[PDB]
Amino acid sequence: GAMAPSYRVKRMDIAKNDEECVVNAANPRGLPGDGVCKAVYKKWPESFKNSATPVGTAKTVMCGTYPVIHAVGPNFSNYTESEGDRELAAAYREVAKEVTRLGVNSVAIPLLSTGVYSGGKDRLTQSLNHLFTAMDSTDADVVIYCRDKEWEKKISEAIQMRT
Numbered sequence: 001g002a003m004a005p006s007y008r009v010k011r012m013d014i015a016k017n018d019e020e021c022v023v024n025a026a027n028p029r030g031l032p033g034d035g036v037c038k039a040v041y042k043k044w045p046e047s048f049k050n051s052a053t054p055v056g057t058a059k060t061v062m063c064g065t066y067p068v069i070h071a072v073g074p075n076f077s078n079y080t081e082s083e084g085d086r087e088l089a090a091a092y093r094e095v096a097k098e099v100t101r102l103g104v105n106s107v108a109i110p111l112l113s114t115g116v117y118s119g120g121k122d123r124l125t126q127s128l129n130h131l132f133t134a135m136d137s138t139d140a141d142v143v144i145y146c147r148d149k150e151w152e153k154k155i156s157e158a159i160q161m162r163t
């Protein structure tokens, strides 16, 4: 574990992370996809060997010895708000199980279901609170990656307000 487990947020490509493993915002079919998924495919394409997994689950595939945790958030275009919320919470619980199983001291994580799977809604708070619910009992340093300047500020505020 980290000596003083922390949350941090950085605004940059998660393909450039400084953590011991990465969470991919994956699709269920293990396809290169778009956004974070496409960045992860470009950086760690070896990790997409048998990475297909259902919605609400995470499946880790090693790129060399570097773990890529493929976490499949729901596409809110396809799910009802209720069932999408349930699957999004479940995907993060499976991320916390994998981070724990791997014994890493740090993990790079994007906000699941916030991009093209958002169904055109702002899900920063929904997705971040499910991240916290799952990761709070872990002792890994968690570094959240985002691209939007206003999201960085809002994530940073949510982190700092619980310290």
Ligand SMILES: [Cl-]
Pocket (backbone or CB within 6 Å): 012, 013, 016
């Ligand atoms: Cl960047």
Ligand SMILES: [Cl-]
Pocket (backbone or CB within 6 Å): 025, 112, 113, 114, 115, 116, 117, 118
């Ligand atoms: Cl997404």
Ligand SMILES: [Cl-]
Pocket (backbone or CB within 6 Å): 146, 147, 148, 151
């Ligand atoms: Cl963002």
